[PDB]
Amino acid sequence: MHPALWVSKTGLDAQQTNIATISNNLANASTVGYKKSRAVFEDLFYQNINQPGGQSSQNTELPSGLMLGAGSKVVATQKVHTHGNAQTTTNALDMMVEGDGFFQVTLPDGNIGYTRNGQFTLNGEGTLVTSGSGYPVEPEIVIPEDAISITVGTDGEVSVRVRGQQDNQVVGQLTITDFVNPGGLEPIGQNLYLPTGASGDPQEGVPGLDGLGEIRQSMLEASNVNVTEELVNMIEAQRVYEMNSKVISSVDKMMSFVNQQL
Template identity: 50%
Template sequence: MDASMWIAKTGLDAQQMRMSVISNNLANVNTTGFKRDRASFEDMLYQNLRQPGAQVGANAQSPTGLMLGTGVRMVSTEKTHVQGSLVTTKNALDIAIQGDGFFQILQPDGTVSYSRDGAFKLSNTGQLVTANGAQLQPAITVPPNVAAISMGQDGTVAVELANGGGAQVIGQLQIARFVNPAGLQAIGQNLLKETQASGAPTIAQPGTNGAGQLQQGALEASNVNVVEEMVNMIETQRAYEINSKAISAVDGMLRFLNQNM
């Protein structure tokens, strides 16, 4: 295969992958706590036909080299952890994080994952859980005879007992922070997983040590900007078309060569 055809093919593959990233962003425009992905590219290895500074004569050196690129590839996708807008729900069990940090969610295998989705529910035992039944950590158990539940910005969880039973503090929410949140691995169900790239979590009380504060009765919306993603989609489509035209152009050149040799 002609080298230029292969180079254009790598461009097609890269733009197709970028379109998949954009499509996923748009698909999750209404997903609570979703963070948009950004595709990153890098050029591939070069054919070094002449080294810059190579000797080209008795007393002369080449001021530039002769290096032919071999294409492009997607090197990473990175989640952009920009704060999404807060949507008021007036649901006592909805919690939004204003600032840095993640909720800790206990998985069935005993490991802990992390999420910005604060749409919690009550299990049949009164524990705060996600929509998929995973338990919030530290565990919060709401008594059965509760008239109202309140959560402070510092994570303090209190309830008002029914029939004039008075107020009672039942727990303290904590959130996890990471040195490199972009290094977290997305595993679906609005959950992220710790990796070596993210570093170990630092557990803090909301509003302390750089951790964000909590807001009850609100949820964090997706930080996907539809207009921006549409612009990226058009740009990707045009880049794909250009690489396709490059393949057609090379095919025409080779056909001309075959017919006239």
């Protein structure tokens, strides 16, 4: 009914999208291998009433044209894929990537999902699976029942020590996947990602060689959320939220006044 009503609606919706992003980051403040997200704003199209530079009279053009904006929206939710802090634990099955790389797991549908979460465990058959829904890690790493200690090297080589044999007996190899633009990955929940068209083609390889990170055993990657930054952003986004509500309040009082008078 009023142009300022629609513009302020876009302002209210964008701030709700921003606060929902910050609230998501605060909720996952203890998730392992969680990447924080930030909302990217951009102004919408501008209504072209008077064209800037239009030939208003000869040898003269409109310096500033009458152009009214249509509001703003959150155009994207960018994942900040910066490395998180390392947690030291006594568990031998939780690993971390020191640098670029993703662990690959087998989804129930058959596809390969990429995860930075290193909390792994074993199932009844001894295959190394995630400590969440139990998705097996690609390639399969099976621990023999005679193993007394499990060690994962820098190059991702999984070896065990068997009672009655000097030198470790290799049982598998870990490979991690990197992407040119990890921010284009699709979050499918459960600390998993899927490649998209904007992410690029997956590129496998041994960890440690050719830019890939190193597998650190008995170590976990904390979420990269800074609650100090998250809390301050909520306060700012709340203020901007109330800025647009005053415009809706002002417009509503304007329309009410015209009905009573005119």
